[PDB]
Design a protein around this ligand. Sequence first.
Ligand SMILES: CCC(=O)c1c[nH]c(C(=O)OC)c1
Length: 116
Amino acid sequence: SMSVKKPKRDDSKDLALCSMILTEMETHEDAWPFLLPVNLKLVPGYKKVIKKPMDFSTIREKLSSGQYPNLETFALDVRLVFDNCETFNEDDSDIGRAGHNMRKYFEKKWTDTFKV
Ligand SMILES: CCC(=O)c1c[nH]c(C(=O)OC)c1
């Protein structure tokens, strides 16, 4: 509270570390469904069903332009990518599978990078 400061983790490397994780995401072989925004004019349903579209290139742009206040807002957008994917795709589809795989890949890198 006021004048009662909690000790707080060093956050000076967060931007660089998030960029690094995002690069590992981008270069994963199952990243292809998520590299670019879904084409809202070629994909039926998507615009109406998915209220907040998100993809790696949009995350990269936001990261590169200081639009994440902290690492948690970054993780929220990354998870949003995979939550959208689950909403729109069958688990037993290539894209569905890819989403699960990439989510797992992210969360381990997240834990290993920041959870001490
Ligand atoms: C034609 C199908 C298609 O373009 C598509 C289906 N699901 C998705 C998607 O969820 O991208 C992440 C794209």
